[PDB]
Amino acid sequence: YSEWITQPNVSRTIARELKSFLLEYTDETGRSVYGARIRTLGEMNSESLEVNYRHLAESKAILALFLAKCPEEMLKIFDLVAMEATELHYPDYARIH
Amino acid sequence: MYYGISQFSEAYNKILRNSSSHSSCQLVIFVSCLNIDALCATKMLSLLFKKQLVQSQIVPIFGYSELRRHYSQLDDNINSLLLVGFGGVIDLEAFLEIDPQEYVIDTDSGEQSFRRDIYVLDAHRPWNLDNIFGSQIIQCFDDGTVDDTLGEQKEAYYKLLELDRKQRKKQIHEYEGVLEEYYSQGTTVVNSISAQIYSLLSAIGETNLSNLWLNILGTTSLDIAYAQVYNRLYPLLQDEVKRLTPSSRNSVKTPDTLTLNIQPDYYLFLLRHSSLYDSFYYSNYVNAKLSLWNENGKKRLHKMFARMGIPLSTAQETWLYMDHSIKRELGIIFDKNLDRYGLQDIIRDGFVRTLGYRGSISASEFVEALTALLEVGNNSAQKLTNLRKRWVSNFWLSWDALDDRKVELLNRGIQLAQDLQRAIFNTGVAILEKKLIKHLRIYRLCVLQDGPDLDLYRNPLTLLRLGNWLIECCAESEDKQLLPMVLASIDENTDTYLVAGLTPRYPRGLDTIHTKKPILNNFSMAFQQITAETDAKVRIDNFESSIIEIRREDLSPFLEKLTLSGLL
């Protein structure tokens, strides 16, 4: 399993799905609560990026199981997707963190 | 047209020859307290006189009756008295109650020589012709701009002078109607006193960098009161700068070298010498645009700051301590972001001057420091005389600060400006959250009863600054139309209310034609009307008609009359 996750091809596909549900997946609301946390943490000017682990299993859950099994690499992927969301919602919020 | 623009130099030479006595002083200077442009003009006159070595006494005044009693104190031999921007509209001669026949020496051909000749340069617009033309002792410097436009009014006034029949009666009545047409008009200013003073200097050709610099400062002071006038005079100031720019280009900065630049300025108080966050924080225009008074204002401020990508702790730290690597890029960053927020109109070119390695100081920063030093540099009527003395002292302190060597005093005024902006912000947010404004659809009414700094607030300039901030806040709220601004403050030491009647003002950047027409302060006429009948013992001795001191108990009937008054 971990060797399969190690493939950067798999990692990039997961990155695509991660960016997809990050803003596109607006669970139970007309707006993505994760997108709401984005640029709010930007306003807070912090680095945490809380997820709650929910709306993840609720969002097709394959990413959820993948994380639960082999986190570290897709945590790094989450950090990357955080970078793109960062500069997206707040341009220039890069190089702050 | 008592004094032609070109004839200003001729009048100046006449004043010289009248007071051409190095042995004996024949010149006295009377200046309105609490006016930046007045201080600039006084500096102008002082430098001119020290060029001519003419003996002179300089006196700061705040009250009209103070002017009268001082004039009583004055010796008749003084053939030269100058007035700076105060009382021009009111008939000073009537206020002075002078007899020209006493004053005229050798009436005969006819010439009018007086042992005291009083020359009045006024910034106020109504410009009473009888004040201008009733007495030759009253010497009025005329911009011409009002005077030529007053040609119909001037000829009507002349006809009234001639006629002292039904057809002639109705003609006189029509002339009186015209008088009332330019009467009942809220006085304003269209000419920064420094501007025409420097024009006269150019006529004499004695202009230096400092003269133009001080003219810039006076105009910048006028900017908030009349933005459009500042904008109109701005190209003239820039052109004169070019006229006086040194030939040397981009020379290495050395302590001897002093340079004044025309570079983009951001409508943030003390921006260079304060931080970024704070400069945004107490900026009245920024506050009104962002509603910073409320918590959501702060939220939006943090959002926009992060939009520039500026780290917070970096933002609250001072501009001077900022790394230049970001400091250079700031302007384009705002260009990219302010527009997205609509805050782009705040960027505009300004005059910032530097000397040696002291640093560059905005003219806006300079005038803010001057205003601060004026405000807080230092029975009940006796207490009010004490406050007038302290205000004169603050005037002298600001005068002294204009000198280059008192950079330390300038920094003190800077600190006072920071503190005053902070306190004004606190008071404004307090009244806004508590909704202490109570608009009566004739005028938005707020009053000061509780809270600290009322002693600071009863200082007229502090009240004026708070009024400007609240006018800016209301105007940026375009949902509610422009309405008169009335503000009343209490002093427990005097136990009577302090009132200033602020005319409504368009938001900055409002170049629409309906915003081109200025607003006239109906407050002044209402106050004069109340003084005329059923007066509540208000004080109008102050050179500002809008600012009025009233018994706290008698203010409620005053408000009732204001509601009754239809001119508001």
PDB file of N, CA and C in Angstrom, chain A residues 2-77:
ATOM      1  N   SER A   2       1.824   1.323   0.923  1.00  0.00           N
ATOM      2  CA  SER A   2       2.650   2.517   1.046  1.00  0.00           C
ATOM      3  C   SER A   2       3.491   2.739  -0.202  1.00  0.00           C
ATOM      4  N   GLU A   3       3.955   1.657  -0.831  1.00  0.00           N
ATOM      5  CA  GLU A   3       4.688   1.801  -2.084  1.00  0.00           C
ATOM      6  C   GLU A   3       3.795   2.375  -3.174  1.00  0.00           C
ATOM      7  N   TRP A   4       2.537   1.935  -3.227  1.00  0.00           N
ATOM      8  CA  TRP A   4       1.606   2.484  -4.206  1.00  0.00           C
ATOM      9  C   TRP A   4       1.372   3.968  -3.962  1.00  0.00           C
ATOM     10  N   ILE A   5       1.198   4.354  -2.697  1.00  0.00           N
ATOM     11  CA  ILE A   5       1.038   5.770  -2.376  1.00  0.00           C
ATOM     12  C   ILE A   5       2.310   6.536  -2.709  1.00  0.00           C
ATOM     13  N   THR A   6       3.460   5.867  -2.634  1.00  0.00           N
ATOM     14  CA  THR A   6       4.735   6.526  -2.882  1.00  0.00           C
ATOM     15  C   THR A   6       4.836   7.034  -4.313  1.00  0.00           C
ATOM     16  N   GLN A   7       4.074   6.445  -5.232  1.00  0.00           N
ATOM     17  CA  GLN A   7       4.125   6.865  -6.624  1.00  0.00           C
ATOM     18  C   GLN A   7       3.653   8.309  -6.742  1.00  0.00           C
ATOM     19  N   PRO A   8       4.501   9.206  -7.247  1.00  0.00           N
ATOM     20  CA  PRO A   8       4.080  10.607  -7.404  1.00  0.00           C
ATOM     21  C   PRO A   8       2.939  10.782  -8.382  1.00  0.00           C
ATOM     22  N   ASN A   9       2.704   9.809  -9.257  1.00  0.00           N
ATOM     23  CA  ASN A   9       1.514   9.834 -10.096  1.00  0.00           C
ATOM     24  C   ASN A   9       0.251   9.778  -9.245  1.00  0.00           C
ATOM     25  N   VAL A  10       0.189   8.793  -8.347  1.00  0.00           N
ATOM     26  CA  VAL A  10      -0.916   8.680  -7.405  1.00  0.00           C
ATOM     27  C   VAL A  10      -1.017   9.943  -6.567  1.00  0.00           C
ATOM     28  N   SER A  11       0.129  10.449  -6.114  1.00  0.00           N
ATOM     29  CA  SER A  11       0.158  11.664  -5.312  1.00  0.00           C
ATOM     30  C   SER A  11      -0.439  12.845  -6.066  1.00  0.00           C
ATOM     31  N   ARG A  12      -0.124  12.974  -7.353  1.00  0.00           N
ATOM     32  CA  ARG A  12      -0.632  14.104  -8.119  1.00  0.00           C
ATOM     33  C   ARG A  12      -2.128  13.978  -8.354  1.00  0.00           C
ATOM     34  N   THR A  13      -2.603  12.757  -8.606  1.00  0.00           N
ATOM     35  CA  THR A  13      -4.044  12.563  -8.731  1.00  0.00           C
ATOM     36  C   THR A  13      -4.757  12.940  -7.438  1.00  0.00           C
ATOM     37  N   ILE A  14      -4.190  12.534  -6.302  1.00  0.00           N
ATOM     38  CA  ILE A  14      -4.765  12.905  -5.015  1.00  0.00           C
ATOM     39  C   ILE A  14      -4.730  14.415  -4.835  1.00  0.00           C
ATOM     40  N   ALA A  15      -3.664  15.062  -5.307  1.00  0.00           N
ATOM     41  CA  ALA A  15      -3.583  16.515  -5.221  1.00  0.00           C
ATOM     42  C   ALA A  15      -4.701  17.169  -6.014  1.00  0.00           C
ATOM     43  N   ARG A  16      -4.978  16.640  -7.203  1.00  0.00           N
ATOM     44  CA  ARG A  16      -6.081  17.156  -8.001  1.00  0.00           C
ATOM     45  C   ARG A  16      -7.397  17.020  -7.253  1.00  0.00           C
ATOM     46  N   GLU A  17      -7.663  15.830  -6.713  1.00  0.00           N
ATOM     47  CA  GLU A  17      -8.909  15.628  -5.978  1.00  0.00           C
ATOM     48  C   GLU A  17      -8.974  16.528  -4.747  1.00  0.00           C
ATOM     49  N   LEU A  18      -7.822  16.772  -4.125  1.00  0.00           N
ATOM     50  CA  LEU A  18      -7.760  17.591  -2.923  1.00  0.00           C
ATOM     51  C   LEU A  18      -8.117  19.037  -3.233  1.00  0.00           C
ATOM     52  N   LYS A  19      -7.476  19.609  -4.253  1.00  0.00           N
ATOM     53  CA  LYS A  19      -7.856  20.940  -4.714  1.00  0.00           C
ATOM     54  C   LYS A  19      -9.318  20.972  -5.127  1.00  0.00           C
ATOM     55  N   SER A  20      -9.805  19.881  -5.717  1.00  0.00           N
ATOM     56  CA  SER A  20     -11.185  19.841  -6.179  1.00  0.00           C
ATOM     57  C   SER A  20     -12.154  19.983  -5.018  1.00  0.00           C
ATOM     58  N   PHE A  21     -11.997  19.160  -3.989  1.00  0.00           N
ATOM     59  CA  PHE A  21     -13.004  19.217  -2.942  1.00  0.00           C
ATOM     60  C   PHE A  21     -12.741  20.374  -1.992  1.00  0.00           C
ATOM     61  N   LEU A  22     -11.534  20.942  -2.021  1.00  0.00           N
ATOM     62  CA  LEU A  22     -11.188  22.004  -1.090  1.00  0.00           C
ATOM     63  C   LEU A  22     -12.119  23.200  -1.228  1.00  0.00           C
ATOM     64  N   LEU A  23     -12.309  23.665  -2.457  1.00  0.00           N
ATOM     65  CA  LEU A  23     -13.233  24.760  -2.711  1.00  0.00           C
ATOM     66  C   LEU A  23     -14.489  24.279  -3.421  1.00  0.00           C
ATOM     67  N   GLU A  24     -14.333  23.370  -4.383  1.00  0.00           N
ATOM     68  CA  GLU A  24     -15.468  22.927  -5.178  1.00  0.00           C
ATOM     69  C   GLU A  24     -16.507  22.219  -4.317  1.00  0.00           C
ATOM     70  N   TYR A  25     -16.060  21.392  -3.376  1.00  0.00           N
ATOM     71  CA  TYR A  25     -16.971  20.646  -2.518  1.00  0.00           C
ATOM     72  C   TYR A  25     -17.466  21.526  -1.378  1.00  0.00           C
ATOM     73  N   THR A  26     -18.689  22.031  -1.513  1.00  0.00           N
ATOM     74  CA  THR A  26     -19.293  22.935  -0.538  1.00  0.00           C
ATOM     75  C   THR A  26     -20.306  22.121   0.259  1.00  0.00           C
ATOM     76  N   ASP A  27     -19.829  21.456   1.305  1.00  0.00           N
ATOM     77  CA  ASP A  27     -20.672  20.514   2.030  1.00  0.00           C
ATOM     78  C   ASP A  27     -21.753  21.254   2.805  1.00  0.00           C
ATOM     79  N   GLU A  28     -23.007  20.855   2.585  1.00  0.00           N
ATOM     80  CA  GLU A  28     -24.165  21.295   3.362  1.00  0.00           C
ATOM     81  C   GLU A  28     -24.390  22.800   3.289  1.00  0.00           C
ATOM     82  N   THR A  29     -23.606  23.500   2.474  1.00  0.00           N
ATOM     83  CA  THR A  29     -23.704  24.946   2.361  1.00  0.00           C
ATOM     84  C   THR A  29     -23.502  25.334   0.908  1.00  0.00           C
ATOM     85  N   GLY A  30     -23.999  26.519   0.560  1.00  0.00           N
ATOM     86  CA  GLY A  30     -23.707  27.076  -0.746  1.00  0.00           C
ATOM     87  C   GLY A  30     -22.256  27.462  -0.933  1.00  0.00           C
ATOM     88  N   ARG A  31     -21.468  27.460   0.140  1.00  0.00           N
ATOM     89  CA  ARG A  31     -20.063  27.822   0.091  1.00  0.00           C
ATOM     90  C   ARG A  31     -19.241  26.749   0.790  1.00  0.00           C
ATOM     91  N   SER A  32     -18.024  26.541   0.298  1.00  0.00           N
ATOM     92  CA  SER A  32     -17.144  25.537   0.878  1.00  0.00           C
ATOM     93  C   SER A  32     -16.630  26.027   2.222  1.00  0.00           C
ATOM     94  N   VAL A  33     -17.002  25.319   3.290  1.00  0.00           N
ATOM     95  CA  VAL A  33     -16.560  25.709   4.625  1.00  0.00           C
ATOM     96  C   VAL A  33     -15.040  25.709   4.699  1.00  0.00           C
ATOM     97  N   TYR A  34     -14.394  24.800   3.967  1.00  0.00           N
ATOM     98  CA  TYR A  34     -12.941  24.837   3.875  1.00  0.00           C
ATOM     99  C   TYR A  34     -12.473  26.095   3.161  1.00  0.00           C
ATOM    100  N   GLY A  35     -13.149  26.469   2.075  1.00  0.00           N
ATOM    101  CA  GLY A  35     -12.848  27.744   1.453  1.00  0.00           C
ATOM    102  C   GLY A  35     -13.085  28.903   2.401  1.00  0.00           C
ATOM    103  N   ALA A  36     -14.099  28.780   3.258  1.00  0.00           N
ATOM    104  CA  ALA A  36     -14.348  29.806   4.263  1.00  0.00           C
ATOM    105  C   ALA A  36     -13.177  29.920   5.231  1.00  0.00           C
ATOM    106  N   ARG A  37     -12.643  28.779   5.676  1.00  0.00           N
ATOM    107  CA  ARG A  37     -11.459  28.797   6.531  1.00  0.00           C
ATOM    108  C   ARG A  37     -10.275  29.404   5.798  1.00  0.00           C
ATOM    109  N   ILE A  38     -10.188  29.164   4.492  1.00  0.00           N
ATOM    110  CA  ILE A  38      -9.203  29.860   3.681  1.00  0.00           C
ATOM    111  C   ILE A  38      -9.545  31.340   3.675  1.00  0.00           C
ATOM    112  N   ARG A  39      -8.504  32.173   3.617  1.00  0.00           N
ATOM    113  CA  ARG A  39      -8.512  33.636   3.586  1.00  0.00           C
ATOM    114  C   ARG A  39      -9.126  34.181   4.870  1.00  0.00           C
ATOM    115  N   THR A  40      -9.683  33.293   5.688  1.00  0.00           N
ATOM    116  CA  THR A  40     -10.004  33.647   7.064  1.00  0.00           C
ATOM    117  C   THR A  40      -8.778  33.431   7.937  1.00  0.00           C
ATOM    118  N   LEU A  41      -8.149  32.263   7.792  1.00  0.00           N
ATOM    119  CA  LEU A  41      -6.801  32.082   8.312  1.00  0.00           C
ATOM    120  C   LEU A  41      -5.846  33.079   7.678  1.00  0.00           C
ATOM    121  N   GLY A  42      -6.095  33.438   6.420  1.00  0.00           N
ATOM    122  CA  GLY A  42      -5.347  34.488   5.766  1.00  0.00           C
ATOM    123  C   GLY A  42      -5.536  35.801   6.491  1.00  0.00           C
ATOM    124  N   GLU A  43      -6.789  36.123   6.818  1.00  0.00           N
ATOM    125  CA  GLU A  43      -7.047  37.261   7.689  1.00  0.00           C
ATOM    126  C   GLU A  43      -6.426  37.051   9.059  1.00  0.00           C
ATOM    127  N   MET A  44      -6.531  35.836   9.601  1.00  0.00           N
ATOM    128  CA  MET A  44      -5.853  35.533  10.852  1.00  0.00           C
ATOM    129  C   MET A  44      -4.345  35.499  10.669  1.00  0.00           C
ATOM    130  N   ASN A  45      -3.882  35.378   9.424  1.00  0.00           N
ATOM    131  CA  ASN A  45      -2.459  35.381   9.101  1.00  0.00           C
ATOM    132  C   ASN A  45      -1.713  34.294   9.866  1.00  0.00           C
ATOM    133  N   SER A  46      -2.289  33.099   9.901  1.00  0.00           N
ATOM    134  CA  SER A  46      -1.690  31.956  10.567  1.00  0.00           C
ATOM    135  C   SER A  46      -1.434  30.843   9.559  1.00  0.00           C
ATOM    136  N   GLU A  47      -1.044  29.685  10.086  1.00  0.00           N
ATOM    137  CA  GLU A  47      -0.518  28.597   9.279  1.00  0.00           C
ATOM    138  C   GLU A  47      -1.218  27.265   9.523  1.00  0.00           C
ATOM    139  N   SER A  48      -2.183  27.212  10.440  1.00  0.00           N
ATOM    140  CA  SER A  48      -2.730  25.935  10.888  1.00  0.00           C
ATOM    141  C   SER A  48      -3.505  25.227   9.781  1.00  0.00           C
ATOM    142  N   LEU A  49      -4.546  25.876   9.256  1.00  0.00           N
ATOM    143  CA  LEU A  49      -5.442  25.304   8.247  1.00  0.00           C
ATOM    144  C   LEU A  49      -6.141  24.045   8.776  1.00  0.00           C
ATOM    145  N   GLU A  50      -7.017  24.290   9.746  1.00  0.00           N
ATOM    146  CA  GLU A  50      -7.850  23.242  10.323  1.00  0.00           C
ATOM    147  C   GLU A  50      -8.762  22.621   9.269  1.00  0.00           C
ATOM    148  N   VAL A  51      -8.965  21.304   9.374  1.00  0.00           N
ATOM    149  CA  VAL A  51      -9.740  20.550   8.400  1.00  0.00           C
ATOM    150  C   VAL A  51     -10.962  19.881   9.023  1.00  0.00           C
ATOM    151  N   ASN A  52     -10.856  19.417  10.270  1.00  0.00           N
ATOM    152  CA  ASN A  52     -11.880  18.701  11.041  1.00  0.00           C
ATOM    153  C   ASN A  52     -12.026  17.248  10.595  1.00  0.00           C
ATOM    154  N   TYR A  53     -11.367  16.836   9.510  1.00  0.00           N
ATOM    155  CA  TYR A  53     -11.326  15.453   9.040  1.00  0.00           C
ATOM    156  C   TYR A  53     -12.697  15.035   8.519  1.00  0.00           C
ATOM    157  N   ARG A  54     -13.707  15.848   8.794  1.00  0.00           N
ATOM    158  CA  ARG A  54     -15.008  15.631   8.201  1.00  0.00           C
ATOM    159  C   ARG A  54     -15.079  16.395   6.891  1.00  0.00           C
ATOM    160  N   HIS A  55     -16.117  16.102   6.112  1.00  0.00           N
ATOM    161  CA  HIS A  55     -16.255  16.612   4.752  1.00  0.00           C
ATOM    162  C   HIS A  55     -15.128  16.045   3.900  1.00  0.00           C
ATOM    163  N   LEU A  56     -14.344  15.134   4.477  1.00  0.00           N
ATOM    164  CA  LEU A  56     -13.299  14.414   3.759  1.00  0.00           C
ATOM    165  C   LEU A  56     -13.766  13.003   3.429  1.00  0.00           C
ATOM    166  N   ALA A  57     -14.121  12.238   4.462  1.00  0.00           N
ATOM    167  CA  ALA A  57     -14.842  10.995   4.238  1.00  0.00           C
ATOM    168  C   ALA A  57     -16.178  11.280   3.574  1.00  0.00           C
ATOM    169  N   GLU A  58     -16.829  12.366   3.987  1.00  0.00           N
ATOM    170  CA  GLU A  58     -18.053  12.796   3.328  1.00  0.00           C
ATOM    171  C   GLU A  58     -17.798  13.156   1.871  1.00  0.00           C
ATOM    172  N   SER A  59     -16.583  13.595   1.546  1.00  0.00           N
ATOM    173  CA  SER A  59     -16.207  13.866   0.160  1.00  0.00           C
ATOM    174  C   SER A  59     -15.433  12.687  -0.431  1.00  0.00           C
ATOM    175  N   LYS A  60     -16.159  11.594  -0.654  1.00  0.00           N
ATOM    176  CA  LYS A  60     -15.762  10.415  -1.413  1.00  0.00           C
ATOM    177  C   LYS A  60     -14.778   9.521  -0.639  1.00  0.00           C
ATOM    178  N   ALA A  61     -14.204   9.987   0.469  1.00  0.00           N
ATOM    179  CA  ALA A  61     -13.627   9.137   1.511  1.00  0.00           C
ATOM    180  C   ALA A  61     -12.400   8.325   1.109  1.00  0.00           C
ATOM    181  N   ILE A  62     -12.050   8.303  -0.177  1.00  0.00           N
ATOM    182  CA  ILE A  62     -10.845   7.583  -0.579  1.00  0.00           C
ATOM    183  C   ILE A  62      -9.618   8.314  -0.072  1.00  0.00           C
ATOM    184  N   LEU A  63      -9.604   9.633  -0.246  1.00  0.00           N
ATOM    185  CA  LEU A  63      -8.588  10.462   0.381  1.00  0.00           C
ATOM    186  C   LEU A  63      -8.563  10.253   1.889  1.00  0.00           C
ATOM    187  N   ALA A  64      -9.735  10.081   2.505  1.00  0.00           N
ATOM    188  CA  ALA A  64      -9.785   9.902   3.950  1.00  0.00           C
ATOM    189  C   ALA A  64      -9.069   8.624   4.364  1.00  0.00           C
ATOM    190  N   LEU A  65      -9.387   7.510   3.706  1.00  0.00           N
ATOM    191  CA  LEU A  65      -8.713   6.260   4.033  1.00  0.00           C
ATOM    192  C   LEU A  65      -7.228   6.340   3.713  1.00  0.00           C
ATOM    193  N   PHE A  66      -6.884   6.962   2.588  1.00  0.00           N
ATOM    194  CA  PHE A  66      -5.484   7.095   2.203  1.00  0.00           C
ATOM    195  C   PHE A  66      -4.695   7.835   3.270  1.00  0.00           C
ATOM    196  N   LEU A  67      -5.237   8.961   3.731  1.00  0.00           N
ATOM    197  CA  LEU A  67      -4.634   9.680   4.842  1.00  0.00           C
ATOM    198  C   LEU A  67      -4.511   8.797   6.069  1.00  0.00           C
ATOM    199  N   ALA A  68      -5.602   8.139   6.449  1.00  0.00           N
ATOM    200  CA  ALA A  68      -5.585   7.341   7.662  1.00  0.00           C
ATOM    201  C   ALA A  68      -4.541   6.238   7.589  1.00  0.00           C
ATOM    202  N   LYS A  69      -4.200   5.793   6.383  1.00  0.00           N
ATOM    203  CA  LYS A  69      -3.226   4.719   6.247  1.00  0.00           C
ATOM    204  C   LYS A  69      -1.804   5.268   6.154  1.00  0.00           C
ATOM    205  N   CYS A  70      -1.538   6.117   5.162  1.00  0.00           N
ATOM    206  CA  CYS A  70      -0.206   6.677   4.918  1.00  0.00           C
ATOM    207  C   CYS A  70      -0.295   8.197   4.862  1.00  0.00           C
ATOM    208  N   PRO A  71      -0.277   8.854   6.021  1.00  0.00           N
ATOM    209  CA  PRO A  71      -0.491  10.310   6.043  1.00  0.00           C
ATOM    210  C   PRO A  71       0.619  11.132   5.411  1.00  0.00           C
ATOM    211  N   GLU A  72       1.878  10.933   5.815  1.00  0.00           N
ATOM    212  CA  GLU A  72       2.880  11.996   5.733  1.00  0.00           C
ATOM    213  C   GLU A  72       2.972  12.607   4.336  1.00  0.00           C
ATOM    214  N   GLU A  73       3.022  11.760   3.307  1.00  0.00           N
ATOM    215  CA  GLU A  73       3.176  12.258   1.942  1.00  0.00           C
ATOM    216  C   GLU A  73       1.993  13.123   1.519  1.00  0.00           C
ATOM    217  N   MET A  74       0.767  12.664   1.773  1.00  0.00           N
ATOM    218  CA  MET A  74      -0.394  13.451   1.381  1.00  0.00           C
ATOM    219  C   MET A  74      -0.655  14.599   2.340  1.00  0.00           C
ATOM    220  N   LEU A  75      -0.078  14.569   3.542  1.00  0.00           N
ATOM    221  CA  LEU A  75       0.006  15.790   4.333  1.00  0.00           C
ATOM    222  C   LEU A  75       0.845  16.835   3.614  1.00  0.00           C
ATOM    223  N   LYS A  76       1.986  16.414   3.074  1.00  0.00           N
ATOM    224  CA  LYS A  76       2.804  17.327   2.278  1.00  0.00           C
ATOM    225  C   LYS A  76       2.033  17.825   1.062  1.00  0.00           C
ATOM    226  N   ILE A  77       1.290  16.927   0.421  1.00  0.00           N
ATOM    227  CA  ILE A  77       0.432  17.305  -0.698  1.00  0.00           C
ATOM    228  C   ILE A  77      -0.607  18.327  -0.259  1.00  0.00           C
TER     229      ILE A  77
END
